[PDB]
RNA sequence: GGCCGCAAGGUUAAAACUCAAAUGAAUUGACGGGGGCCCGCACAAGCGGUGGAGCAUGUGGUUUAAUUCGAUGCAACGCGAAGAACCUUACCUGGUCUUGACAUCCACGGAAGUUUUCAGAGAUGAGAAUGUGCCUUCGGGAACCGUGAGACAGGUGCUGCAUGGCUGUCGUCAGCUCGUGUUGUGAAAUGUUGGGUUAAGUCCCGCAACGAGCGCAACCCUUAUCCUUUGUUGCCAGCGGUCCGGCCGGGAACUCAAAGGAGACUGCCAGUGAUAAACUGGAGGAAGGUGGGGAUGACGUCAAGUCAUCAUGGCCCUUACGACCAGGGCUACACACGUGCUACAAUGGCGCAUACAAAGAGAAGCGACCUCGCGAGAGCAAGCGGACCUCAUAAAGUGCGUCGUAGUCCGGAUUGGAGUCUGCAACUCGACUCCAUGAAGUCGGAAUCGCUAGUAAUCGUGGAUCAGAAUGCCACGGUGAAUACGU
């Protein structure tokens, strides 16, 4: 697993955002399994979802580049910023967090 | 401006020397608010002077006083692209303050067995000066000589104000009459 | 001064109490009460004891 | 920016307190808390309701409660039976006996407290509303006060954000101590949020219930009396 | 704030009490100044240990009306910002703005 | 493509594509390393602190089972959460409960309650003894406890861009605004700008502008010169005992306490100026220009802060974002910062002698004399609810001896040992006292901040909060400067 943010420090701005996951390999033939966490009340209102729609988008990202199989994905934490973030963003963020991680790890 | 105008801050004379300049010399020697100590230092430090010069305390005293501190100093700042320290007359009272600070300044020089002896030190140093500070400051004189440079402005002050001018400074801006 | 934060600020208020000997050194049927109240209350508070 | 309550400044120089009893340090707090308990325990009977708000005294060795109505027939009830039930409700709450209280208000749209709330009740709820304030002011002018301001906030018009409107007539000085006068500020609940109302009423240059200084002593203090000189 | 912290404090006042409170008068002479040993040992000193909690250390308390802690006066038993309100409001007798 | 010229170059002069405007003018807002002008400790003219050293303390960083956060240049960091062993508490580990620790409707079984043993870290569980109350028609009912269901309670749990109430800050800055008339097709102008003057849209003068409201300013608190009533828990001039406390006989001149009254308006005189307003000079006055200080924060704003006072909508768990208990954590650690403390001494330290305060708390509390101990402190105990008492010979300062720049006769972080204190309990991780030990520090970079006089600088005291426990915060009195040309 892993975390990813889009935050920057040189311009006035900060462009924050950020999420942390657990992506862990499963027994062969288990397929694709989902958990959140922060969606109890904080991530969630349309944001629960999205992060799940983000994984479904993420099926068209990767290293080889396509589909997830197996594996379980857990949305452990994250932080939006209210006047720039939306459901989404999260999602756009969440398949980048999933791609980076898969790149870090190795496929 | 500021705005706002008001100056120095009145002082009583401090009880030994009956003078406001003495403090004033107490503070300009004072640290922190210990005026009792600091008075005790200034009278000790003059009693040593102080034995260190002359034979008394006050004769220093004016030698340091004279140093030490002046008559000139410098004013800032700024003129075109730069800032300069241009010479002016001190401030009559400040200076001092000049300084009283130079004699205490520094001191502090430092060294250390008593203030303080440090007074002080210098009065002995300064003061004869020859003391540090007297050299202080000379630096004032530096200066500043540096700076002599000029300051006026820059064109406008030197700048645009033609009056009597010989400048053409300050006054409106003047033609004939009415 | 704020519900939350802060420098600085803070905050300032007062209350507070006048007092106290009136304070009288002896009771009387009309000063008894009040004496009753005075306490009856509330806006005043009254002690009577000699101590 | 932010302001003082006209109020409150304020008290003890132009305006009475809130409650009026002695407590503290060993009983002050607690109490103060009883309170606070009276509040909440009595005021849910008042809320239905024309009471604006209440004042507490505490005399004692009782409690407490002076009530300004608004309304008074609606809180007194048939032959006074409720004012006896009011309270019995004091108490309950609390540790002493409790007494009610009467209060009369008020010129009722003069307030604020009762004017607000009258517009808070319309906004609760919700009605066309908006309006309301205009109104309320007219109202209040109206019945009495030399000027009145009203302000209504929270979110306004149903919403997404937040919000606020005001009106206001005559006025209304602010810094004049001071005085007085008033004043407020009351809220809240509705299905979209909290709703809030302020009211400020300038009565003119008139003296208050006190304050701050007493009248002159020298008439007070006179020199002609006998004394101390103690301590004997 | 929470109703559990309020609560707890009123439970704790409470219990404590039966214990503190009465205990404490014993502590300390049964250990500490004091104590004989017969004590302190613990055990006799378990009289202090068993209730805990009821202890003043904890009892604390805190406000209270709002309940909250670490932000109240206490002389009034009140929060704080609620003292403050309150004050404007005049709900506390004699209490006013502040100036000097 | 054509045309002109030796030619660079000139000339005639498109289209496809593409954007949703581009463009002239004027008004309002806002801005300038454009002009004029006024002011603020804004800068100078000065004084003193701050950066380097060690520590106090909050935030960030690193770390951890956990280290509760929010805030984050102004608008954050000794702030809100004013005093985290525990509780408080957010967090972690382990134990443990599910109509619940708290709460309402309803029914069923028991009065509430008291006493008591044992397992267990305790929560919790089981056993044993014991009371039989209150209202009453003595039927029955209520209180309080236990059990049980549909609801539901509970949530320091999210959302401050859902919202109220409250607050920061520009800043006590001099501004803000409406009605009517006039003026412009209009934004809007006029008034609110001009002239004199001011701390100021302050005051006065004057014009197609006029009329009116809010802010500025008074009120109201505080400080102190004076007039006056009064006299203990206060005072003491002339009288008196007391080997010297107004203790007490005595006294009311006086201090003080705190109640009422007087005073300041450029008023008055002289000068300037539009014979204005105002300003300068002077007398009178305790004080001269709201005498000084405070409360006071308009209109408007950062799409400011507040789910952590409080309120309350939305969203969400109750198989718990609830709740009980023992222990742990909030305090860990090669870091960095914001803010604070303390020293480097000699107009300082140390030992002895020694003078002059304000303010504030105290009914399971404060506390002298006296007794015990080296001492924290404890014992004993007058007094008191404080104008009645204690902190208390306040310290700096004053008198005397001593030190000579030596890392000291300074500093005294660190570190060993022992004693005292609150509390269930001082292991991580509190405070105080005694003995011993011992380090950086020689007045500190790029740099920087507060202050115009009873101010700064500098010395001590008290309180909230508070079982106990500040070098922060709030308030107090002592000593008490330098300099202010210039703009």
Swiss-Prot record, chain A:
Tell me the domain of life.
Answer: Bacteria
* Described purpose of this protein according to its UniProt entry: Abolishes the inhibitory effect of tetracyclin on protein synthesis by a non-covalent modification of the ribosomes.
The similarity annotation says: Belongs to the TRAFAC class translation factor GTPase superfamily. Classic translation factor GTPase family. TetM/TetO subfamily.
- Its recorded name reads Tetracycline resistance protein TetO
As recorded in Swiss-Prot or TrEMBL, the protein's gene is named: tetO
Whole sequence portion shown? 427 to 533 of 639
From Swiss-Prot, chain B:
Give the SUPFAM superfamilies listed for this entry: Ribosomal protein S7 (SSF47973)
Q: By its UniProt entry, which InterPro entries does this protein fall under?
A: Ribosomal_uS7 (IPR000235), Ribosomal_uS7_bac/org-type (IPR005717), Ribosomal_uS7_CS (IPR020606), Ribosomal_uS7_dom (IPR023798), Ribosomal_uS7_dom_sf (IPR036823)
GO terms, biological process: cytoplasmic translation; negative regulation of translation; ribosomal small subunit assembly; translation
Q: Zinc-finger among the record's keywords?
A: no
**Further facts:** The strain K12 sequence is shown. Has been predicted to contact the N-terminal domain of IF-3 based on footprint studies; exactly how IF-3 interacts with the 30S subunit is controversial.
The signal sequence is: none
Q: Which residues form a coiled coil?
A: none
Name of the protein in question = Small ribosomal subunit protein uS7
Protein family: Belongs to the universal ribosomal protein uS7 family.
Q: How does it assemble?
A: Part of the 30S ribosomal subunit. Contacts proteins S9 and S11. Cross-links to IF3 and the P and E site tRNAs.
Keywords recorded for this protein, A-Z? Ribonucleoprotein, Ribosomal protein, RNA-binding, rRNA-binding, tRNA-binding
Function recorded in the entry = One of the primary rRNA binding proteins, it binds directly to 16S rRNA where it nucleates assembly of the head domain of the 30S subunit. Is located at the subunit interface close to the decoding center, where it has been shown to contact mRNA. Has been shown to contact tRNA in both the P and E sites; it probably blocks exit of the E site tRNA.
Task: Quote a single Gene Ontology cellular component term.
Answer: ribosome
Curated annotation (Swiss-Prot), chain C:
Q: Does the keyword RNA-binding apply?
A: yes
GO CC annotation: cytoplasm; cytosol; cytosolic small ribosomal subunit; small ribosomal subunit; transcription elongation factor complex
Keyword field: Ribonucleoprotein, Ribosomal protein, Ribosome biogenesis, RNA-binding, Transcription, Transcription antitermination, Transcription regulation
Q: Does the keyword Zinc apply?
A: no
Among the GO molecular function terms of this UniProt record, one is:
tRNA binding
Query: What's a GO biological-process term for it?
Result: cytoplasmic translation
Per the record, the similarity remark reads:
Belongs to the universal ribosomal protein uS10 family.
Subunit details: Part of the 30S ribosomal subunit. Can also form a heterodimer with the transcription antitermination protein NusB. Binding of S10 to NusB is mutually exclusive with its incorporation into the ribosome. The rRNA transcription and antitermination complex (rrnTAC) consists of RNAP, NusA, NusB, NusE (this protein), NusG, SubB, ribosomal protein S4, DNA and precursor rRNA; S4 is more flexible than other subunits.
> What name has this protein been given in UniProt?
Small ribosomal subunit protein uS10
Q: What is the lineage of its organism?
A: Bacteria, Pseudomonadati, Pseudomonadota, Gammaproteobacteria, Enterobacterales
Q: Which gene encodes it?
A: rpsJ
Complete-protein stretch covered: 53 to 103 of 103
Curated annotation (Swiss-Prot), chain E:
What's one GO-annotated cellular component?
Answer: cytosolic small ribosomal subunit
Q: Which domain of life is it from?
A: Bacteria
User: One biological-process term from Gene Ontology?
Assistant: translation
Assigned protein family: Belongs to the universal ribosomal protein uS14 family.
Question: What's the gene?
Answer: rpsN
Describe the function of this protein: Binds 16S rRNA, required for the assembly of 30S particles and may also be responsible for determining the conformation of the 16S rRNA at the A site.
Would you tell me the protein name for this molecule? Small ribosomal subunit protein uS14
Return the InterPro entries for the record.
Answer: Ribosomal_uS14, Ribosomal_uS14_bac/plastid, Ribosomal_uS14_CS
Q: Please provide the record's keywords in A-Z order.
A: Ribonucleoprotein, Ribosomal protein
User: Which Pfam family, any one, appears in the UniProt record?
Assistant: Ribosomal_S14
One function term, GO molecular function aspect: rRNA binding
**Origin organism of this chain?**
Escherichia coli (strain K12)
Q: Which residues form the signal peptide?
A: none
Classification via PANTHER family: 30S RIBOSOMAL PROTEIN S14 (PTHR19836), SMALL RIBOSOMAL SUBUNIT PROTEIN US14M (PTHR19836:SF19)
Oligomer status and interactors:
Part of the 30S ribosomal subunit. Contacts proteins S3 and S10.
